[PDB]
Structure 1
């Protein structure tokens, strides 16, 4: 079968030279519509982004959107069982920057998360999830405005590697035999009818993630980088991550001991600000983000903890449905709606397009088109403050004007 992707007539491919993006005034940007409500949120995103771009650069710049496939629609386009075409992986890497709506993975076919598949296949080792409060957002906590963090979640290793064997399977038995007999393992409480999973954490995987986190704090003049881990129980994976992260701060960024330790100060080479590098045990951290959110800023953590932390933080600022996210690697980046596919509402034009729209904001910023990105943030802030919102917000507040998904995209534009 031939590619069903149509490369835009007008439009030029973004290139990368010396680790820096070279973006034309007419970049071709691949986008995956997304399953379920992607059908509602993606069009709203396309419209909002084009407006921000038009408004910021007076027509001098324009994105040439190119639809690519993954998920249910992909099976619809490329046929039964083509959930993630090789061409989509090729195209994202080729065009450098892309965006996607939500995706779901089918059950019953032994297929692993398509979202994780994209991340791992493309080596997008940074899952970047910034979490801030938008004034006017109905929140479950008393002071959501104190929350302004940026999560750098390691995206290529940890238990997400997908290395595991089913209880009673011959492989699981093989692995357990090896562990008990050759490794001398005596700690498996119940070796029978036992599932086994492997959790890897490497020096290189950890340092490239933390390096990106510290560079981000420097580039954005943030106040601190917190290494979140459960190293007191998992000494060689989680504790190693913490150790390697502080070691990198010291080796590459001149981090030096604060008082008697364990924290370090890294001087911002551009503002002279001293960035604090510290660490918090993961369970305690889930308490600290609620109790002393003002003390945290950039967070660097492993894959699973980051999955939990980003979800917990989004919920607390009332942002469960408008949380932006990006998956960034050294050769390309994939921005994404971070919520689910909500099939019950799909096609109804009712869900909140705020998440994919703020992911588009991150995308534009990544492309260096910061004026367009600032217009989207400004639009999002005014629409929400205007209390002209979608049902998920409206139902939690008084005096709100209920808007459809499409209408909220307009409201964002009306507020740029």
Structure 2
């Protein structure tokens, strides 16, 4: 029957881009006869202002009652001076990921046709193009390991975090990465620091174990330091990157920046039962909120991922995805996607969402 979405738009540009994603979703809902109901909940900075913490109990409960979380972006200068355990980004995201066992983080990143010049890559390298999916383990590793904290005082005061992974944790995220590569260019690059870390040694070992179920998929391993170098020089040679929590954090950001168009990039954080959290790869960008300049595509595509992965509405997802393609090849680009020559052709946040929603309605 009726799917239920918890909408957690957050701070900065979160609400202005979410409006567009909802618009585009309305068009898909009409097209494909989907019954989806949405409820908005405060999260992040806005929840601190309205409820005193970044993840109110009522927001968490709302997410428990939902089929998926359509998440915008959290954080801003207003809350930057809070203590770490009170700050809105970590305080929204990590407890959500932990509470819903969102172990799989998917961050697809491609260099889009006609947007090479925005890539910080040398032109010959951007011309080759790339499509790299980062598959990052999201509920384990050093993010959530214990013990975590500090002891002592003065010069001998120490703080500590424990990177821990079990075989089961590694194998479930590896399987996602292999399955994904099977649908793509059949290569998994597993990123670790096996020359230094015991966690990484187990990582590498278990990824090799999972590989036996995927004779069709090429496995290679790379150190995270070396990986930062290779993505810069030859990102065309990667297909799926499979990473631990901290290493995928790092690499997914690098890869996103290499596109030159982070406003296009969405992500999915999924548990094993199909519930997930779908959010743009980029931040709350408070510098631009309320001006109608923010690119809503990453939010719109977060809604497409939501449809695909949580709602099992692949047609609807793909329709959104095609409508975004159509915008990008029909002169509907926000200002950050354009060179200075061309920046006067910039579309506003509402123009973009209107275009995209209209493309969905028109049968793209």
Task: Find the counterpart in structure 2 of residue 53 from structure 1.
Answer: 29
1:70 corresponds in structure 2 to: 43
1:382-397 matched pairs, under 5 angstroms: 382-396=326-340
* 2:335/2:343 contact within 8 Å kept: no
Following the alignment from structure 1 to structure 2, what is the Cα–Cα distance between the partners of residues 359 and 380? 12
Counterpart of 2:179?
215
Q: Which stretch shows the higher mean deviation, 90-99 or 331-340?
A: 90-99
Q: Structure 1 CA distance, aligned partners of 2:113 and 2:203?
A: 35
Q: Secondary structure at the match of 2:218?
A: strand
Q: Does the aligned pair in 1 maintain the 2:107–2:281 contact within 8 Å?
A: no
Task: Give the 3-state SS of the residue equivalent to 1:344 in structure 2.
Answer: helix
The separation in 1 between residues aligned to 2:326 and 2:41, in whole angstroms, is 32
Partner of 2:206: 244
CA pair 153-397 structure 1, distance change in 2 beyond 3 A: farther
Helix, strand or coil at the partner of 1:327: strand
Secondary structure of the structure 2 residue equivalent to 1:73: helix
Q: Quote the Cα distance in structure 2 between the aligned partners of 1:384 and 1:47.
A: 18
Q: Is the CA contact (8 Å cut-off) linking 2:54 and 2:86 kept in structure 1?
A: no
Aligned residue in 2 for 1:184: none
TM norm structure 2? 0.87
Bigger-Rg structure (1/2):
1
Work out whether residues 136 and 387 of structure 1, in 8 Å CA contact, stay in contact via their aligned partners in 2.
no
- Secondary structure (helix, strand or coil) at the match of 2:46 reads helix
Choose between structure 1 and 2: higher helix proportion.
2
From 92, 110, 113, give the equivalent of 2:63: 92
| 2:133–2:241 Cα contact (<8 Å) kept | yes
- Confirm or deny: 8 A CA contact 2:4 2:67 kept in the other structure: no
Query: In the alignment, is the contact (CA less than 8 A) between 1:52 and 1:375 conserved in 2?
Result: yes
Distance 1:116 1:406, change over 3 A: same
Indicate the SS of the match to 2:97: helix
**How many Å apart are 1:83 and its aligned residue?**
2.1
Q: Do the aligned residues in 1 keep the contact of 2:21 with 2:296 (CA within 8 Å)?
A: yes
Q: Match for residue 301 of structure 2?
A: 358
Give the deviation of 1:161 after TM superposition: 1.9
- 2:242 counterpart residue number: 300
Residue of structure 1 in register with 2:109 after alignment: 131
Query: Equivalents in 1 of 2:277, 2:318: separation in Å?
Result: 20
Offset, 1:397 = 5.3
What is aligned with 1:262?
A: none
Q: Which residue of 2 aligns with 1:348?
A: 291
Per mean C-alpha deviation after superposition, the further-off stretch among 388-397 and 123-132 is 388-397
- Equivalence map 1:159-238=2 (5 Å): 159-161=142-144, 163-166=147-150, 169-170=151-152, 192-218=156-182, 220-234=183-197, 236-238=198-200
Matches within 5 A, 1:273-352: 274-331=216-273, 332-352=275-295
Query: Paired residue for 1:379?
Result: 323
**How far 1:74 moved relative to its partner?**
2.5
Q: Which residue matches 1:259?
A: none
Secondary structure in 2 aligned to 1:36? coil
8 Å contact kept, 2:184–2:239: no
Rounded Cα–Cα distance in structure 2 between residues aligned with 1:407 and 1:119: 33
- What residue ranges of structure 2 are gaps of 5+ in the alignment? none
The offset of 1:240, in angstroms, is 1.4
Aligned partner of 2:82 in structure 1 is 108
| 8 A contact 1:27–1:64 mirrored in 2 | yes
For residue 395 of structure 1, report the CA deviation from its aligned partner: 4.6
Q: Pairwise mapping of residues 2-13 of structure 1 onto structure 2 (< 5 A)?
A: none
Query: Shift of the alpha carbon at 1:396?
Result: 4.8
Partner of 2:22, secondary structure, is helix
Matching residue of 1:157: 140
Map 1:263-282 to 2 at 5 A: 266-267=214-215, 274-282=216-224
